[PDB]
Each structure stands twice: as structure tokens, then as C-alpha cells.
Design a protein around this ligand. Structure first.
Ligand SMILES: Nc1nc2c(ncn2[C@@H]2O[C@H](COP(=O)(O)OP(=O)(O)OP(=O)(O)O)[C@@H](O)[C@H]2O)c(=O)[nH]1
Ligand SMILES: Nc1nc2c(ncn2[C@@H]2O[C@H](COP(=O)(O)OP(=O)(O)OP(=O)(O)O)[C@@H](O)[C@H]2O)c(=O)[nH]1
Ligand SMILES: Nc1nc2c(ncn2[C@@H]2O[C@H](COP(=O)(O)OP(=O)(O)O)[C@@H](O)[C@H]2O)c(=O)[nH]1
Ligand SMILES: [Mg+2]
Ligand SMILES: [Mg+2]
Lengths: 427, 434, 65, 432
């Protein structure tokens, strides 16, 4: 049909995946046991895209959970939906990466990359017509940033036609929880660019600002950050799982958000973001959905799009609505913010409609788009990277893995080459 | 599953192990007999191993070249808690002599301690690391520990060896020949160690007097504080957390070069119940307390140096939100300095379970706590003072006759002095800014 | 000695700037594990497709004679 | 059914027969009178009488009355039938000659007649367990004689040979090595397996493991009882892999001139030590390879194993047995010859070992027994030949031996055979 395989790497990626598998099980009316307690029929017609059939009316998600430390897996199995995932899909190493990219990517990821190879190949041959693979991880880690990128390197050779979209987590300069973070990031972004059809820059600090001010949360935890990504995760696929007036799929946006293969970096957005109490005010219409989703404060990446030029914009709406107000609304915001759009692609906006709203909520929209402001993110990494590289610092950890020194230089060449050609399209 | 083996050496090692293992028993709920009466299920698997009789045995190696200190444990409250093979004693001590601890008496039992640690590693499946607790002053805890770590690095090249050791104090001293063993242990702790936790007793004296109001404390007070610090560093392995941080993670994010593995530890808050009755505590509170030079566990001022790398362990009712606010406020201070080549030098870990309090302690029951490991260059002045006093003895050839009669060659004194001078030079090179 | 700080936890009834938004967002509050608000709405879902409505009125509407 | 008849000889034999049969009574439930207070597992050791009694099928033999008289007035005085305990008026006093050609022949027929009636009682006899010493003259001179005269009566019945070899350093006699040489013709010609053991090695194991700084021969006696119980444990009680005496003889002796394996037992720990150490299959199988745990003063690391036999008993699962032997094969200092690819023989028993009151080994749920044939035993005989030539050159103590009634040519022949015995062991030690 059109199935999706969900990869999962690292302490980070495992926690977003558990939250994401939570909501779409709540959406499809799936209890934590694994049975169906939904009411409507549309909730169970395309469950095959995410849920694999089992005996007794049971469904298993098509996920591959990987981490080099087994201590995250015990928290995964013990969560709310901790038993809904198949034990054979738990693949793990005995020793963690220790936040070293080189350790995870070569020394310890090589042994375990064959086991994750076997399951996903088994899961690939289970479904009939696979649309593509999804994966969630962190670039500041050692498992997802390290061996996780090695997964991306392998499967493009095995399955080139299938679309790969990475909802990676990009570290912040203002808030850093890893000293050697610019290293592992720099030997990561070089690995994404060569083989990744679309990338989604996620920054915790930006999500951190949103829970600060947009939702006014006194004590937000990590889960709400994962909830917003999970909501973002659901809002891009929802045009596939359910019927819509104007349908789309991953390909329809994966074909459309990239004018040139080197450009596959986008920041994601979610339109309705208010308080739980305040929903009964805020008279909900289609125009207000537009206003929330062209605000830089709504954006979940660490870049303000005002300093960049919006190359491409695609928005997917949900729930029953008549379409006239929408098509004039990005018709509206295209003219007035003309300086913020490129001139060499007229009508920069793609639209799509899913007729089914998310559970409990009435109208929502999902924003993915390409712009020049993502170049601001990488150059901040390089200024951290070269300074820590100018003194050969934090290098004996990488040198002791058996790797050489030029890998830092060519990677420093590549994203410098990327930002150079990215800058050339701004002007 | 993660396992950390303790290799405590000497009187200091045995006392510190008493404090630390009673703390572990208290938090895990282990009775001194060693049975469970009733985050994580196997949270005791990092420290304790199951037996057939439903009894948990610690993964500890107590080694001392004098039997009094270990007979205290053998006849103490925790007699049945410990394997009498795990406790290893020598008939005659090194008598504050590095040469005796390194060439004559240690070799009689080096094979025995090797066999014991071999068995202790064989029992475990996945060993995370080796925590070596000792002191440079005592002849046993210097020489025997140096030999053990020498043979340990060649037996287990990959397994990390973390160093918790007690330095000679800048002003007070329990010995006069302590600086000799201090010089001669520096080569071994430079070559066969992954990170060090140099502790002097004067700073802890000042902390306990000024903060905990104890005008007349004892050695168990400092040992309890060290056990609290070790509990904080092992908390991410023992219990679950939002950001679980293994030993390898902070080894990676604290060590720039193979010759720089000397950060500084810092634990906060340290207050009495009479004060915690009224003072409200927060993440900003504890992170500002962690940067006080009078609060530092070594006798050096980081304001006279530059912070290179900081590893923070938040514990309890902590939230990353306030963690990042604390981080931003810390970044917005001039007095706190960083090197040119480390723009982002923070390594954050978070654990759920707030620290537990022993009866007979001084720390109030606090919901949040924090441990800091700061690699910085202000530590070099301590070795500079050590070099000053060591040359101030070596020039007139004092105390070397005992060592020579024990049977080593006098050149190694000058070689180790040159090694420490070169290490200070290297720290100066790192402190150089471009 | 003494420690400096900035902000504090306070309590719920006592006046603090943003107490009102705290207590209006109190519905579905849980502060660790999971999220807090669960689903962004809690009202009634609905499953009427546009083609389904556009097709079903012929079956059921104002059957004028 | 299965039956074992014991022919213990010497002050060792009487003392080890008492200790071993003390264990035999406790495991089954025999009272010191001989009463069962509460299927026929005891038939291998006991037998029914006309009063419902159980009588051990053992023949204690000694040529001095005072050793066996302590048994006749002992706790089990009414358990042993008085004819089965055989005495003699005068002894050899540490001389092979006197116990083999002058005093031995006085009692040959009565002991042989006694063994006939015990064998007459048995229906299918499995083997003869024989215990004696190379040091004592009566445990060497006479025990050699019966082996020749038992073999003519039963040429095919198995004759296992548990013996006390002299210790490499300590000794209870000076004239001891003479008895050691001329007896080694007997244990070669009329024996089927060997279990030599020196008290020095057990003296080491007991003081270092069981924490008894002053053990006695009883402590040494009990440990040998644990070995002989486990080698017979397959016969007495049921199990997954029962292993008969005929079974382990085949997978221990590659060549008939090589029937000298080494026994090993594990664990041997005190209850003070047993409380804190967890005992698993791996933890007990590695101790059976440690040279410090051997009952013979020789290091197998100086040699190579020909054949190893496994006797597992207790709470033992077939899964951990294959995992234990897997790790053992993966150790380099454990060596094997080129012509023995697979040198194991596993047996599984269910009844766990029992403890005697006043014993040393703590009650345990599982254990292991080893029977390993290695060539490192050969150096023990070379030292004995060394000690023999330092006294045969001076012709010392020989005037005792010739005066008893045997020729001077025999010491040369006996010394020569052991050199040929030592030479054959190197041929096996050679790898092609
Ligand atoms: N912090 C702390 N330091 C200790 C403790 N016990 C001993 N020390 C330090 O150890 C130094 C002397 O070494 P000891 O541990 O007493 O003796 P040793 O290590 O066995 O070496 P020998 O003296 O040769 O036997 C002293 O200068 C103390 O500073 C302790 O319980 N806590
Ligand atoms: N292990 C062990 N050895 C014993 C025991 N009893 C005697 N021996 C050994 O026997 C040797 C001396 O010979 P004995 O058995 O005492 O006397 P014998 O065999 O009757 O020979 P004669 O002295 O000529 O009568 C000593 O060296 C002991 O090692 C015993 O109970 N256990
Ligand atoms: N948004 C979000 N970020 C997370 C979560 N868990 C971890 N992270 C981030 O992931 C980074 C650490 O990744 P790490 O665990 O070392 O990755 P690994 O080496 O692949 O296991 C940190 O900077 C965190 O900010 C989560 O649940 N949500
Ligand atoms: Mg001492
Ligand atoms: Mg005798």
C-alpha cells in the first residue's frame, strides 16, 4: 500500500519515537494493549501504513528501536505504551557511545549495524509497497549522530528509490549540553547532505522558547517538547492515512520542497498553539490559522526567517473546511511579504488538505518550508568547530579510534561549500 | 548492564569505602546483613551482585598493608556485608614509604589482589569502569596503588580507570615525607589514569566549618561528603533520568588532550537543617553556589585560571528550563572565564532520584542537588608549590637514604620532578590564548 | 554562608506575575514522564466527509412534493 | 543388580574404609546398628540379611590388630559383621618384602575365601574398589599379592586402584621409596585405573580453603570419601546421564599402559566462605583445572591432557554444562594432544552431596568431579627414581629385604620398568 518504517536511535530519538507512537495510537483509537477501541470506520482502514497485522485483532508498529546503551530500553518497555512494541525490534549494544561520534560510527556501530540491518530488511519484506523510511535522532549524540548516520549511508545503497526524511535534532549555541558537540555535528551534517531527501532541523531551545511564552508553561518537561514534535510528526503524514479533498503524500512534498538536491533543509511549524483554558475564547477561523503559522516565534528551529528568503513553502491543513479562504491567505501573505520570498520561483506555496482533524482538536495546519535562514545555523557551528579545531582540541578521542585528521578538513570543506552555494542563491 | 568496581587502597581507601558503601546500602535499602526486605528495578546491579542465598555482595576491593583498619570493618556493623576474601591485608605496612610500597612489600600480594579483581570482573558481564580511591601521602596508598594501576592498565587496556585520591594539603600535613611519595605517584597517575579528583582536606575543613557550622568535625564528615559526591557521579548509572550520562560521556567531554585529566569536583548545596529551614533553594541557587571559590574542594582560585570544560550533574526536582536559565546567567558573567577554543564547554546530565541522607549526617534532606567537574588551569599552582617544597628538600639530599636502602635508583626523583615541571609547562601552554 | 538565586517556586494562591495563566492552564497539569495536556482538544470528533455530505443529501433532504 | 565390593588394605585402608562408610550410612539412612527407620539404591553398598539387616560388602585387611580393634569397639561395632574385618598377629613394619613373601602368605587364603562369599552374595558385580598405600609394607606387600591372586580368580572384573603415593617433600618413613618402586609393577600389571594422591597436596588444599590451620588425617579422610561417593554416584542414584564404572574406564585410558589419571574435586569451601560466594557451574568447573586444587603434586600446565572425564552432580542443568566446557576449550594454557580432539565425558546426577556432622565442606547444591589423564604425572615418578638411585647405589637397607626371602635382581628390574614407564609417557607427549 504506502507503508512507513520508523527508525529510532539514541536516548533522544527513542524518546521522541515513543511519544510519536503514542499520539497516532491515540488517534487510531488503539489501546495500550494493542487492540482497537476506536469508534469510526475511517480510524481503521489504512492502519496497515503504520500498524502491522497480528492475531486476535492486534497491531504492532513497524518501528526499529536502536541504542548502544540498554538502559534507555528499560524505560521504553516500562512506559505507558511500553509493551506495544515487539521485543524483537529492541536491538541494543552493551556499551554506550560516550558522546563520541567516531566511537559510535566506526568502532562499536559496525558490529551492531548488521542486526538493525536484519530487522528492517525483514520489516521491509513484510509490507507490500513501501513508501520510504523515517528516523529520529540527535546530532549532538554518539549513537544517533554516529552509527545512526551510518544507517543512512547503508540503506540508500540497498533501497535508493525510497524517500528518506530525517527529523534530526540540531544543537543550540546558546544552550549546549555537550562540550564536544560541534565535532559530532560537523562529521554528521556532511553525512546527511550526500544522502537525505529532506531534513527537519529541530532545536530544543526554540521548542524551549515556545513552552516559555506561547504556552506559558511554568514547569514544562521533556515530554511536551516530544509532544510538539509528535504533533509535527503526525501533521505531515495525515494526508496519507486519511482521505482528503486535495491529497498529498511524502513524495508530493519531497518532490516539491527541493529545487536542487543539495537543498533539503527545512524548519517545521504547527499552527494552533494556545493555552488549554483559552480555547473556548479565540473564536477559531481559517484566517487566524494563517496568522500563527507565519510568525517567527512559532517556528521550532533556532533561526529567524526574517534574515532569510523563503525559497519554498508547503502547508497541509486538516478537518472539513472549504478551501477559498486558505488559497487567498497564502495568496495574501505572498504579496505583502514579497521581500521575504524569492523572485525566481513564482507562487512559492504548495497546499494540501486532509479531511480528518486530529483527535479532540478541530482545525490544524502543518508548515514545512525551505528558506535561507537555515544557513545561519551551520555557520554558527563552523565558528565553534574551527576554534576548537584550531588547537587540535578534543581530538585524541577521535584520533584514538583509528581515524585520520583529514576527515575533519573535508567535512569542514563540505558545509563551507554548502553555505557558500546556499548564500549564492540568496543573492 | 553497567558495572563499576571499587579498588580502594590504604587507610583512606578503606574509610572512604566504609562511608560510600554504607551510603549505597542506605539508598538501595540494603540492610547491613545484605538482604532486600521488599527509578529502576535492578538499580543495585551497578554496585551489588546477587548470590544463591538471596544475598547481595558489593563489587569492592579493600586493600591495605596494615590489618588494623580492615579488622575494624571485619568486627564492625558491616562484617557480614563484605566478602572476607574481598578484604586484603598486609602484615607490615609501607610505613609512609613509596619505595616500600612499590618494590618490597607490595609484590608479595600483587598476585593476590590481581586474582581477586580478576574474579570480581569475571562475575560481572558488562563492566563500565574502575573507581580507584587512595592517597598520595601514605606509602601503601601511593606505591601499591601505583603498581596496581600499572598492571591494571596492561591487563585491561580498554576499561576506564577513574582516580579519586587525597593530596597532601598546602598548609597542614599529617606527614613529613609525604611530598616524596607525592612526586613519585605523579608519573603513574599521569600515564595510567583517565581522570583525577585531587582532594585536599583544608578546603573541606573550611566548607564544613563555614557552611555546616561544625567547629569540631571529624574524618567521617569529609568521608561522607566524598561519598555524597561519588553517589552523585554514579546516580546516572544507578537510576533513570531524562539525560542519563555514563562515565565515558564525561570522559569525552572533560579531556582535551591525553595529558590533561585533572578537573576539580564541587558539590552543592552543603547546608545544615537549621539553615535549610528558611533558605529557599533553586537551580540558580545551587549553580551560583557551585561557582564560589571558597566553596571549591581544592585549594585554588579558578579566577586565577580559566575554565576549560564543565560537566554538571543535576539531581532531584530539576527541570531543564531552569537548568538553561542557570547556564545563560553563568555565561553572562565576566568573572567566569573560558578559553578561546571552547565556546561551548558544558556537559549536562539529569537524574530523577534526589540524594538520600544518612542518620548521623549533617546535610539536610534536600530535594535538588548538583555536582560539577571543572577542568581548568588554576590547578597548576598546587603542583607548583609541591615542586617548590620538593626541591627545597632535594637540594640537601634529605630522607633519600631510607628510599635507597629500600632499593630504588635516585635518578627517578629528578625524572619525576622534570615530569611535573613539564606538565605545569603544558598547562601554561593550554592557558596561552591566541 | 548564603546563596544568591533569582526567581523562586512560590505557591499557587500567592500573587505572582503569571499566576493567572498558571491557574487557567491548570486543567490537565502533571509535573518526569509523558506530556501534560494529552490531546490538544477534548471535545467531540466528527467523521463527515465532503463527498459523503455531497452524496447523502440526495438520500435525506427536503423531499418536496 | 549394581554392586561394589571394597578391599581396603593398610592403616590407610582401615581408616579410609571407616570414613567412607560413615558417609555411605548417612546418605541412605542406615542406623549405626544397621536399621532403616523408614528404591534399592543401597544394594550397591549394603545387603539384606535374615534379620532384615544391611551389612557392608567391604573387607578390611591389616596385619596388626590394634588398627582394626579400634573399629571393633567403635560406634558401628554392630554394623560390620566380624569376619569381614581381618587382622594379623604381626605386621611388615614398612617393608614390602615381609608383607609379600613371609607374613602375607599366612592370611592369603582366608582373605581370598572371605572375598569369595561376598562376591557369591552379589549377582552382577560391577567392579572392585581397592584402597591401600605405597608407604606401608602391609598395604603394599600384601595388597600386591592379592591383586595377582584376585586377577586369576576374576580376570575380567575391574580393579580400580586408589592409593597413597608418598609426598614429594614430607615423609613418614625413610625406607619408603623401596616399597614404592617394587609395588609399581603390580599397579601396572594387575590394575585397571589409578588414583594416586599424596597427603601433602590435600594438606595444602584443606588449610588454604577450609581454614583449618591444624587438620588431621580424618579431614583428609573425608575429602577422599567425597571423591569416591561421586564416582559411584551414577550407580547408586538415578540421573539423566548415568555413567557406570565400565563407562569411564573406556573414556580415560587411550592405551592400556596409561591408566594413571588425576582426580579433582570442586568446590571445597567453608560455610564462612560459602555465604559470600555464589556457586554456579562455571565457578566450580574452573577450580577443577587450578594447579593449586590438585591432589597430586604436579602441574598439568607442564604437560598435556589425554582424557578428561566429567562427573556432574547436584542442581546441574545440561545447558550450563555445555557452556562450561565451551569456555574450558577456550583457554590456551590448558593444552591437549594432537590426537584427542574431543576429550570430555559428561555424566549428570540428581542427588546433591550430603554433609557429615563434624565435617568440613559446607552443604552445597551442586559440585563437580574431575578424572583427567595428563602426562604431568610422569615427573612425579622421575623424582622417585632420583630418590631411589641415591640409596640403591649405596645398597642401603637392602640387607633387610634379602633376608626376608627375595633375590637382589628384582630391584634392578623394578627400577628399569618405571624408566620404561616414564619413556612411554614422553612418546604420548610427543606431537606428530
Ligand atoms: N579524606 C581522608 N583522607 C584520609 C583518610 N584516611 C587517611 N587519609 C589520608 O591518607 C594519608 C596517609 O595515608 P593512609 O591512608 O593513612 O595510609 P596508607 O594509604 O595505608 O599508606 P601507609 O601509611 O604506608 O600505610 C594521610 O595524610 C591522610 O591525609 C580518610 O579517612 N579521609
Ligand atoms: N591419607 C591417609 N593416609 C594414611 C592413613 N593411614 C595411614 N596412612 C598412610 O600410611 C603410611 C604408613 O603406612 P600405614 O598405612 O600406616 O601402615 P601399613 O600400610 O599397615 O603397613 P605397615 O606399617 O608395614 O603395617 C603413612 O605414610 C600414611 O601416609 C589415612 O587414614 N589417610
Ligand atoms: N527534544 C528532545 N531532545 C532530547 C530528548 N532526549 C535527549 N534529547 C537531546 O539529545 C541530546 C543528547 O543525545 P544523546 O543521548 O547523546 O544521543 P545518542 O548518542 O544517539 O544516544 C541532548 O542535547 C538532548 O537535548 C527528548 O526527549 N526531546
Ligand atoms: Mg597507612
Ligand atoms: Mg602399618
Amino acid at each position: 500500500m504506502r507503508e512507513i518504517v520508523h527508525l529510532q536511535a539514541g536516548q533522544c530519538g527513542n524518546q521522541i519515537g515513543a511519544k510519536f507512537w503514542e499520539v497516532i495510537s491515540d488517534e487510531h483509537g488503539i489501546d495500550p494493549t494493542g487492540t482497537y477501541h476506536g469508534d469510526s470506520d475511517l480510524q481503521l482502514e489504512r492502519i496497515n501504513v503504520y500498524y502491522n497485522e497480528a492475531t486476535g485483532g492486534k497491531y504492532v508498529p513497524r518501528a526499529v528501536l536502536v541504542d548502544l546503551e540498554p538502559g534507555t530500553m528499560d524505560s521504553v518497555r516500562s512506559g505507558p505504551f511500553g509493551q506495544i512494541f515487539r521485543p524483537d525490534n529492541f536491538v541494543f549494544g552493551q556499551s554506550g557511545a560516550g558522546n563520541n561520534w567516531a566511537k559510535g560510527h566506526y568502532t562499536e556501530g559496525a558490529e551492531l549495524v548488521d542486526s538493525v540491518l536484519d530487522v528492517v530488511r525483514k520489516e521491509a519484506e513484510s509490507c507490500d509497497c513501501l513508501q520510504g523510511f523515517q528516523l529520529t535522532h540527535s546530532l549532538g549524540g554518539g549513537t544517533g549522530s554516529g552509527m545512526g548516520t551510518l544507517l543512512i549511508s547503508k540503506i540508500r545503497e540497498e533501497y535508493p528509490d525510497r524517500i528518506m526524511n530525517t527529523f534530526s535534532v540540531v544543537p543550540s549555541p546558546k544552550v549546549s549540553d555537550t562540550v564536544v558537540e560541534p565535532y559530532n555535528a560537523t562529521l554528521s551534517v556532511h553525512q546527511l547532505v550526500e544522502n537525505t531527501d529532506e531534513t527537519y532541523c529541530i532545536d530544543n531551545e526554540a521548542l524551549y522558547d515556545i513552552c516559555f511564552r506561547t504556552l506559558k508553561l511554568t514547569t514544562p518537561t521533556y515530554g511536551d517538547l516530544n509532544h510538539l514534535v509528535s504533533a509535527t510528526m503526525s501533521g505531515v503524514t495525515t494526508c496519507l492515512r486519511f482521505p482528503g479533498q486535495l491529497n498529498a503524500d511524502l513524495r508530493k512534498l519531497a518532490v516539491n520542497m527541493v529545487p536542487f538536491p543539495r537543498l533539503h533543509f527545512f524548519m517545521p511549524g504547527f499552527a494552533p498553539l494556545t493555552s488549554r483554558g483559552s480555547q473556548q475564547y479565540r473564536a477559531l477561523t481559517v484566517p487566524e490559522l494563517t496568522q500563527q503559522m507565519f510568525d517567527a516565534k512559532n517556528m521550532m528551529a533556532a533561526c529567524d526567517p526574517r534574515h532569510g528568503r523563503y525559497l519554498t513553502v508547503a502547508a497541509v491543513f486538516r478537518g472539513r473546511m472549504s478551501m477559498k479562504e486558505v488559497d487567498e491567505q497564502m495568496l495574501n501573505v505572498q504579496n505583502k511579504n514579497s521581500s521575504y520570498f524569492v523572485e525566481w520561483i513564482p507562487n512559492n506555496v504548495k497546499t494540501a488538505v486532509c479531511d480528518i482533524p486530529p483527535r479532540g482538536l478541530k482545525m490544524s495546519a502543518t508548515f514545512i518550508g525551505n528558506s535561507t535562514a537555515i544557513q545561519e545555523l551551520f555557520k554558527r557551528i563552523s565558528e565553534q568547530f574551527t576554534a576548537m579545531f584550531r588547537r587540535k582540541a578534543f581530538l585524541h578521542w577521535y584520533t584514538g579510534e583509528g581515524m585520520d585528521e583529514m576527515e575533519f578538513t573535508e567535512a569542514e570543506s563540505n558545509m563551507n561549500d554548502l553555505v557558500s552555494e546556499y548564500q549564492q542563491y540568496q543573492d | 548492564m553497567r558495572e563499576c568496581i571499587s579498588i580502594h587502597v590504604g587507610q583512606a581507601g578503606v574509610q572512604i569505602g566504609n562511608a560510600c558503601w554504607e551510603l549505597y546500602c542506605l539508598e538501595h535499602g540494603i540492610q547491613p546483613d545484605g538482604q532486600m526486605p521488599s527509578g529502576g528495578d535492578d538499580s543495585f546491579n551497578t554496585f551489588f551482585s546477587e548470590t544463591g542465598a538471596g544475598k547481595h555482595v558489593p563489587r569492592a576491593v579493600f586493600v591495605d598493608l596494615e590489618p588494623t583498619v580492615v579488622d575494624e570493618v571485619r568486627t564492625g556493623t558491616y562484617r557480614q556485608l563484605f566478602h572476607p576474601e574481598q578484604l586484603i591485608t598486609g602484615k607490615e605496612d609501607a610505613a609512609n614509604n613509596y619505595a616500600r610500597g612499590h618494590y618490597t612489600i607490595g609484590k608479595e600480594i600483587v598476585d593476590l589482589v590481581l586474582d581477586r579483581i580478576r574474579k570480581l570482573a569475571d562475575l560481572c558481564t558488562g563492566l563500565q569502569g574502575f573507581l580507584i580511591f587512595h592517597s598520595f601521602g601514605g606509602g601503601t596508598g601511593s606505591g601499591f596503588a601505583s603498581l596496581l594501576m600499572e598492571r591494571l592498565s596492561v591487563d585491561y587496556g580498554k576499561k576506564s580507570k577513574l582516580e579519586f585520591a587525597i593530596y597532601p594539603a598546602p598548609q597542614v600535613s599529617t606527614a613529613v615525607v609525604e611530598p616524596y611519595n607525592s612526586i613519585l605517584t605523579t608519573h603513574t597517575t599521569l600515564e595510567h589514569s583517565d581522570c583525577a579528583f585531587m582532594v585536599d582536606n583544608e578546603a573541606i575543613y573550611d566548607i564544613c566549618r563555614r557552611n555546616l557550622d561544625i567547629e569540631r568535625p571529624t574524618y567521617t564528615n569529609l568521608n561522607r561528603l566524598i561519598g555524597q559526591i561519588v553517589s552523585s557521579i554514579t546516580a546516572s548509572l544507578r537510576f533513570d533520568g531524562a539525560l542519563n550520562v555514563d562515565l565515558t560521556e564525561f570522559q569525552t567531554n572533560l579531556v582535551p588532550y591525553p595529558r590533561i585529566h585533572f578537573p576539580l569536583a564541587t558539590y552543592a548545596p552543603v547546608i545544615s537543617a537549621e539553615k535549610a529551614y528558611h533558605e529557599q533553594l533553586s537551580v540558580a541557587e545551587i549553580t551560583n553556589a557551585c561557582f564560589e571559590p571558597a566553596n571549591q574542594m581544592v585549594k585554588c582560585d579558578p579566577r586565577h585560571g580559566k575554565y576549560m570544560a564543565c560537566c554538571m550533574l543535576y539531581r532531584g526536582d530539576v527541570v531543564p528550563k531552569d537548568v538553561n536559565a542557570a547556564i545563560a546567567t553563568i555565561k553572562t558573567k565576566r568573572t567566569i572565564q573560558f578559553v578561546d577554543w571552547c565556546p561551548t564547554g558544558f556537559k549536562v546530565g539529569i537524574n530523577y532520584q534526589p540524594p538520600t541522607v544518612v542518620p548521623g549526617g549533617d546535610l539536610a534532606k534536600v530535594q535538588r542537588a548538583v555536582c560539577m567537574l571543572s577542568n581548568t588551569t588554576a590547578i597548576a599552582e598546587a603542583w607548583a608549590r609541591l615542586d617548590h617544597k620538593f626541591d627545597l628538600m632535594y637540594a640537601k639530599r634529605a630522607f633519600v637514604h631510607w628510599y635507597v636502602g629500600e632499593g630504588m635508583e635516585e635518578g627517578e626523583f629528578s625524572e619525576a620532578r622534570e615530569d611535573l615541571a613539564a606538565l605545569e609547562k603544558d598547562y601554561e601552554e593550554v592557558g596561552v590564548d591566541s | 554562608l548564603t546563596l544568591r538565586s533569582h526567581h523562586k517556586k512560590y505557591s499557587e494562591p500567592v500573587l505572582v506575575y503569571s499566576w493567572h495563566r498558571n491557574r487557567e492552564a491548570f486543567p490537565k497539569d502533571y509535573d518526569l514522564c509523558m506530556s501534560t495536556y494529552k490531546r490538544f482538544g477534548s471535545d467531540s470528533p466528527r467523521w463527515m466527509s465532503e463527498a459523503r455530505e455531497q452524496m447523502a443529501q440526495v438520500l435525506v433532504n427536503k423531499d418536496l412534493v
